[PDB]
Design an enzyme around this catalytic site. Structure first.
Site, PDB file in Angstrom:
ATOM      1  N   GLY A 141       0.641  -1.243   0.127  1.00  0.00           N
ATOM      2  CA  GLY A 141       0.083   0.521   0.027  1.00  0.00           C
ATOM      3  C   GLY A 141       0.597   1.025  -0.597  1.00  0.00           C
ATOM      4  O   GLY A 141       1.633   1.177  -0.829  1.00  0.00           O
ATOM      5  N   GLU A 142       0.847   1.974   1.014  1.00  0.00           N
ATOM      6  CA  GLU A 142       1.258   3.703   1.072  1.00  0.00           C
ATOM      7  C   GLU A 142       1.498   3.808   2.208  1.00  0.00           C
ATOM      8  O   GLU A 142       1.988   4.819   2.751  1.00  0.00           O
ATOM      9  CB  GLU A 142       0.556   5.026   0.179  1.00  0.00           C
ATOM     10  N   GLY A 143       1.625   2.962   3.613  1.00  0.00           N
ATOM     11  CA  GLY A 143       2.142   3.291   4.342  1.00  0.00           C
ATOM     12  C   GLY A 143       1.027   3.607   5.660  1.00  0.00           C
ATOM     13  O   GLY A 143       1.658   3.869   6.393  1.00  0.00           O
ATOM     14  N   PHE A 194      -1.020   2.052   6.860  1.00  0.00           N
ATOM     15  CA  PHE A 194      -0.480   1.283   8.025  1.00  0.00           C
ATOM     16  C   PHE A 194       0.744   1.259   9.058  1.00  0.00           C
ATOM     17  O   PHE A 194       1.393   0.510  10.325  1.00  0.00           O
ATOM     18  CB  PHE A 194      -1.214  -0.161   8.397  1.00  0.00           C
ATOM     19  CG  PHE A 194      -1.974   0.083   7.651  1.00  0.00           C
ATOM     20  CD1 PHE A 194      -3.752  -0.117   8.337  1.00  0.00           C
ATOM     21  CD2 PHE A 194      -2.732  -0.243   6.249  1.00  0.00           C
ATOM     22  CE1 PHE A 194      -4.660   0.054   7.916  1.00  0.00           C
ATOM     23  CE2 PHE A 194      -3.592  -0.773   5.583  1.00  0.00           C
ATOM     24  CZ  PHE A 194      -4.684  -0.166   6.577  1.00  0.00           C
ATOM     25  N   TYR A 197      -2.131 -10.955   5.351  1.00  0.00           N
ATOM     26  CA  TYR A 197      -2.266 -10.129   4.695  1.00  0.00           C
ATOM     27  C   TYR A 197      -3.985 -10.282   3.606  1.00  0.00           C
ATOM     28  O   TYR A 197      -4.305 -11.504   3.909  1.00  0.00           O
ATOM     29  CB  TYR A 197      -1.125 -10.858   3.252  1.00  0.00           C
ATOM     30  CG  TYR A 197      -0.992 -10.564   1.799  1.00  0.00           C
ATOM     31  CD1 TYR A 197      -1.270  -9.101   2.064  1.00  0.00           C
ATOM     32  CD2 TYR A 197      -1.001 -11.175   1.283  1.00  0.00           C
ATOM     33  CE1 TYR A 197      -0.833  -8.728   1.251  1.00  0.00           C
ATOM     34  CE2 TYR A 197      -1.152 -11.105  -0.107  1.00  0.00           C
ATOM     35  CZ  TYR A 197      -0.995  -9.290  -0.639  1.00  0.00           C
ATOM     36  OH  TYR A 197      -0.645  -8.687  -1.927  1.00  0.00           O
ATOM     37  N   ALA A 198      -3.742  -9.012   3.013  1.00  0.00           N
ATOM     38  CA  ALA A 198      -5.003  -8.739   3.192  1.00  0.00           C
ATOM     39  C   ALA A 198      -5.124  -8.556   1.431  1.00  0.00           C
ATOM     40  O   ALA A 198      -4.356  -7.038   0.983  1.00  0.00           O
ATOM     41  CB  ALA A 198      -5.924  -7.186   3.440  1.00  0.00           C
ATOM     42  N   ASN A 245      -7.279  -1.892   0.867  1.00  0.00           N
ATOM     43  CA  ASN A 245      -8.451  -1.358   1.744  1.00  0.00           C
ATOM     44  C   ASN A 245      -9.468  -0.980   1.070  1.00  0.00           C
ATOM     45  O   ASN A 245     -10.153  -1.232  -0.498  1.00  0.00           O
ATOM     46  CB  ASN A 245      -8.250  -0.268   2.555  1.00  0.00           C
ATOM     47  CG  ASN A 245      -8.130   1.619   1.563  1.00  0.00           C
ATOM     48  OD1 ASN A 245      -9.237   1.984   1.200  1.00  0.00           O
ATOM     49  ND2 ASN A 245      -6.831   2.457   1.600  1.00  0.00           N
ATOM     50  N   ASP A 262     -11.190   4.823  14.944  1.00  0.00           N
ATOM     51  CA  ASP A 262     -11.150   5.660  13.799  1.00  0.00           C
ATOM     52  C   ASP A 262     -11.388   4.606  12.935  1.00  0.00           C
ATOM     53  O   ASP A 262     -11.036   4.308  11.808  1.00  0.00           O
ATOM     54  CB  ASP A 262      -9.256   5.911  13.688  1.00  0.00           C
ATOM     55  CG  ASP A 262      -9.440   6.126  12.191  1.00  0.00           C
ATOM     56  OD1 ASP A 262      -9.899   7.044  12.072  1.00  0.00           O
ATOM     57  OD2 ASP A 262      -8.427   6.981  11.736  1.00  0.00           O
ATOM     58  N   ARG A 294     -10.987   3.377   4.970  1.00  0.00           N
ATOM     59  CA  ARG A 294      -9.518   3.365   5.021  1.00  0.00           C
ATOM     60  C   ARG A 294      -9.077   1.597   6.191  1.00  0.00           C
ATOM     61  O   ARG A 294      -8.358   1.460   5.283  1.00  0.00           O
ATOM     62  CB  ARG A 294      -9.344   4.222   4.699  1.00  0.00           C
ATOM     63  CG  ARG A 294      -9.195   5.071   6.527  1.00  0.00           C
ATOM     64  CD  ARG A 294      -8.673   6.460   6.330  1.00  0.00           C
ATOM     65  NE  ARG A 294      -8.663   6.939   7.424  1.00  0.00           N
ATOM     66  CZ  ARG A 294      -9.730   7.330   7.967  1.00  0.00           C
ATOM     67  NH1 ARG A 294     -10.471   8.129   6.715  1.00  0.00           N
ATOM     68  NH2 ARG A 294     -10.057   7.738   9.124  1.00  0.00           N
ATOM     69  N   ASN A 295      -9.532   1.667   7.106  1.00  0.00           N
ATOM     70  CA  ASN A 295      -9.345   0.788   7.916  1.00  0.00           C
ATOM     71  C   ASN A 295      -9.515  -0.805   8.019  1.00  0.00           C
ATOM     72  O   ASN A 295      -9.355  -1.253   9.154  1.00  0.00           O
ATOM     73  CB  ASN A 295      -9.398   1.334   9.194  1.00  0.00           C
ATOM     74  CG  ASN A 295      -8.336   2.895   9.809  1.00  0.00           C
ATOM     75  OD1 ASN A 295      -7.131   1.828   9.238  1.00  0.00           O
ATOM     76  ND2 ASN A 295      -8.871   3.641  10.336  1.00  0.00           N
ATOM     77  N   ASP A 347      -5.770  -1.965  12.040  1.00  0.00           N
ATOM     78  CA  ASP A 347      -5.335  -0.300  13.189  1.00  0.00           C
ATOM     79  C   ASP A 347      -6.716  -0.424  14.379  1.00  0.00           C
ATOM     80  O   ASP A 347      -6.861   0.854  14.442  1.00  0.00           O
ATOM     81  CB  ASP A 347      -5.867   0.923  12.492  1.00  0.00           C
ATOM     82  CG  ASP A 347      -5.145   1.867  12.968  1.00  0.00           C
ATOM     83  OD1 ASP A 347      -4.622   1.778  13.341  1.00  0.00           O
ATOM     84  OD2 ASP A 347      -6.177   2.798  13.231  1.00  0.00           O
TER      85      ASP A 347
HETATM   86  C1  66T Z   1      -4.245  -4.345  13.930  1.00  0.00           C
HETATM   87  O1  66T Z   1      -4.346  -4.297  12.395  1.00  0.00           O
HETATM   88  C2  66T Z   1      -2.863  -4.005  11.887  1.00  0.00           C
HETATM   89  C3  66T Z   1      -3.403  -3.864  10.465  1.00  0.00           C
HETATM   90  C4  66T Z   1      -1.449  -4.011   9.736  1.00  0.00           C
HETATM   91  C5  66T Z   1      -1.333  -3.870   8.196  1.00  0.00           C
HETATM   92  C6  66T Z   1      -1.772  -5.894   7.477  1.00  0.00           C
HETATM   93  C7  66T Z   1      -1.377  -5.472   5.925  1.00  0.00           C
HETATM   94  C8  66T Z   1      -2.007  -4.494   4.825  1.00  0.00           C
HETATM   95  C9  66T Z   1      -2.443  -5.404   4.029  1.00  0.00           C
HETATM   96  N1  66T Z   1      -2.391  -5.122   2.808  1.00  0.00           N
HETATM   97  C10 66T Z   1      -2.566  -3.987   2.456  1.00  0.00           C
HETATM   98  O2  66T Z   1      -1.893  -3.334   2.840  1.00  0.00           O
HETATM   99  C11 66T Z   1      -2.509  -4.019   0.754  1.00  0.00           C
HETATM  100  C12 66T Z   1      -2.480  -4.602  -0.133  1.00  0.00           C
HETATM  101  C13 66T Z   1      -2.829  -4.471  -1.660  1.00  0.00           C
HETATM  102  C14 66T Z   1      -3.155  -2.891  -1.871  1.00  0.00           C
HETATM  103  N2  66T Z   1      -3.241  -2.742  -3.079  1.00  0.00           N
HETATM  104  C15 66T Z   1      -2.727  -1.808  -3.487  1.00  0.00           C
HETATM  105  C16 66T Z   1      -3.764  -1.432  -4.458  1.00  0.00           C
HETATM  106  C17 66T Z   1      -3.530   0.141  -5.759  1.00  0.00           C
HETATM  107  N3  66T Z   1      -3.960  -2.165  -5.548  1.00  0.00           N
HETATM  108  C18 66T Z   1      -4.572  -3.455  -4.932  1.00  0.00           C
HETATM  109  C19 66T Z   1      -5.284  -4.646  -6.130  1.00  0.00           C
HETATM  110  C20 66T Z   1      -4.340  -3.676  -3.814  1.00  0.00           C
HETATM  111  C21 66T Z   1      -2.968  -1.849  -0.846  1.00  0.00           C
HETATM  112  C22 66T Z   1      -2.628  -2.374   0.701  1.00  0.00           C
HETATM  113  N4  66T Z   1      -2.461  -6.619   4.132  1.00  0.00           N
HETATM  114  N5  66T Z   1      -2.133  -7.085   5.684  1.00  0.00           N
HETATM  115  C23 66T Z   1      -0.318  -3.968  10.192  1.00  0.00           C
HETATM  116  C24 66T Z   1      -0.185  -4.232  11.095  1.00  0.00           C
HETATM  117  O3  66T Z   1       0.596  -4.693  11.400  1.00  0.00           O
HETATM  118  C25 66T Z   1       0.768  -4.725  13.131  1.00  0.00           C
HETATM  119  C26 66T Z   1      -2.049  -3.900  12.608  1.00  0.00           C
END
Ligand code: 66T
Length: 282
Positions: free
Chosen positions: A21-23, A25, A99-100, A104, A158, A162-163, A176
């Site tokens: 993504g773009e940071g 999280f 992983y998702a 978002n 929040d 987006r979350n 988050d």
């Molecule tokens: C408690 O909560 C959290 C959440 C997280 C984040 C974990 C996370 C993030 C992701 N994933 C992405 O952040 C993601 C993936 C693909 C994206 N996209 C880009 C877009 C342009 N095209 C789309 C086709 C896909 C955009 C963003 N998964 N798990 C970490 C964490 O630490 C403790 C705690």
């Protein structure tokens, strides 16, 4: 950091991949975990790995640890981002979580808008439109994640599209939850009072995001006027393509009196029923 054998994964089991993504999280990368399950040591699992930025502070470390520790306590639910492990010894803290792959919920919905002056699709990689049932189901899944968190006495503070992250299999997962004004209940905004009831208010805004396919709440309303206007009873109009019933749900979530808002428990029951009755042809 003291070791916690419950969650520890040796560092060399992780093959660190690209930034995700773009940071939003923090510094999160895609990774492959070898033998994340001790039962299947020869399997690789795609995971997300959170770690500290380069010029971090002692504050950032304590927050990441706090986040990890809270996630340890929160327990599992399919509609939240779950903790999978951690690398705390022999290098930087890695917090390994689910992983998702579809990003978002806001960007997910925007990319699925019809190809439209009114509601423009910003993706250079647009994806198939969501059916009306898919959309209600997305609301139901978010509600389910929130019902779980509220049951564990977790206030999110929040909640917003987006979350919520979306997996490969289209599962909604609250992110988050472990450690913006347009999503805040008036009492949170004014008096800094955060509750399950204010999360419900946020959920109402999130519903509106869903039924506008990732629309921006209170379009053109300056932040500095917004509390004043909310106090006066201002509420978003119904999205063009939204049933009156789902709109009334949004409105209920935005009750001026927090005690009069529905609970997540009630919202889940209500959405369950609405999902069942929503045509799978439209
Ligand atoms: C408690 O909560 C959290 C959440 C997280 C984040 C974990 C996370 C993030 C992701 N994933 C992405 O952040 C993601 C993936 C693909 C994206 N996209 C880009 C877009 C342009 N095209 C789309 C086709 C896909 C955009 C963003 N998964 N798990 C970490 C964490 O630490 C403790 C705690």
């Amino acid at each position: 950091l003291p070791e916690d054998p419950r969650w520890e994964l040796p560092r060399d089991r992780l093959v660190l991949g690209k930034p995700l993504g773009e940071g939003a999280f923090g510094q999160v990368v895609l990774a492959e975990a070898i033998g994340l399950d001790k039962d299947k040591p020869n399997r690789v699992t795609k995971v997300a790995v959170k770690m500290l930025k380069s010029d971090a502070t002692e504050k950032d470390l304590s927050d990441l640890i706090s986040e990890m520790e809270m996630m340890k306590m929160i327990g599992k639910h399919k509609n939240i981002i779950n903790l999978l492990g951690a690398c705390t010894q022999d290098g930087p803290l890695y917090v390994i979580v689910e992983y998702a792959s579809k990003g978002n919920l806001r960007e997910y919905l925007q990319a699925r808008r019809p190809p439209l002056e009114y509601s423009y699709n910003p993706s250079h990689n647009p994806e198939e439109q969501l059916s009306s049932k898919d959309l209600v189901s997305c609301a139901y899944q978010v509600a389910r994640g929130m019902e779980y968190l509220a049951s564990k006495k977790c206030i999110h503070r929040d909640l917003a599209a987006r979350n919520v992250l979306v997996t490969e299999d289209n599962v909604m997962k609250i992110a988050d939850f472990g450690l913006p004004v347009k999503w805040m209940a008036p009492e949170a905004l004014f008096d800094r009072i955060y509750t399950h009831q204010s999360d419900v208010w946020s959920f109402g805004v999130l519903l509106w995001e869903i039924f506008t396919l990732g629309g921006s709440p209170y379009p053109g309303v300056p932040v500095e006027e917004l509390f004043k206007l909310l106090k006066e009873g201002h509420r978003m109009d119904k999205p063009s393509n939204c049933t009156n019933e789902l709109y009334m749900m949004m409105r209920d979530c935005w009750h001026a009196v927090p005690s009069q808002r529905p609970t997540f428990k009630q919202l889940v029951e209500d959405l369950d029923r609405i999902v069942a009755l929503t045509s799978n042809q439209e």
